[PDB]
Amino acid sequence: XHXRWD
């Protein structure tokens, strides 16, 4: 949802 964090 935020970039690499998803």
Backbone as numpy.savetxt, mean C-alpha at the origin, in Angstrom:
# Nx Ny Nz CAx CAy CAz Cx Cy Cz
-3.43 -0.60 -0.11 -4.20 0.70 -0.11 -3.39 2.07 -0.11
-2.19 2.04 0.48 -1.24 3.20 0.50 0.00 3.11 -0.46
0.18 2.01 -1.22 1.40 1.75 -2.04 1.88 0.28 -1.77
3.18 0.11 -1.46 3.75 -1.19 -0.96 3.05 -1.90 0.25
2.55 -1.08 1.19 1.65 -1.46 2.31 0.38 -2.32 1.97
-0.22 -2.16 0.77 -1.36 -2.99 0.30 -1.08 -4.52 0.07
